[PDB]
Amino acid sequence: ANNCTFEYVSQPFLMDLEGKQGNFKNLREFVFKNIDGYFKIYSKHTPINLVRDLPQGFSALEPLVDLPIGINITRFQTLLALHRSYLTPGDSSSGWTAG
Amino acid sequence: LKPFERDISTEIYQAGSTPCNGVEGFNCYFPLQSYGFQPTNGVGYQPYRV
Ligand SMILES: *[C@@H]1O[C@H](CO)[C@@H](O[C@@H]2O[C@H](CO)[C@@H](O)[C@H](O)[C@H]2NC(C)=O)[C@H](O)[C@H]1NC(C)=O
Q: Does B10 touch chain A (CB under 8 A)?
A: no
Q: Does the CB of A37 have a partner CB in chain B at under 8 Å?
A: yes
Choose among A82, A93, A91, A88: nearest CA to A17. Answer: A82
**What spacing in Å lies between the alpha carbon of A7 and ligand 1's midpoint?**
27
CA distances from B18 to A25, A44, B9, B13, B31 (A): 58, 50, 18, 9, 13
Task: Give CA–CA dist A16/A31, Å, rounded.
Answer: 24
Q: Which helix (H) or strand (E) holds A68?
A: strand A62-68
Q: Ligand 1 centroid to B26 CA: how many Å?
A: 24
Tell me the structure's resolution in angstroms, rounded to a single decimal: 4.2
Contacts A72 to B, Cβ<8 Å: 2, 5
Atom of ligand 1 nearest to the CA of A72: 1
Q: Tell me how far apart the alpha carbons of residues A54 and A50 are, in angstroms, rounded to a whole number.
A: 7
- Sign of the C-alpha dihedral, residues A10, A12, A16, A22? negative
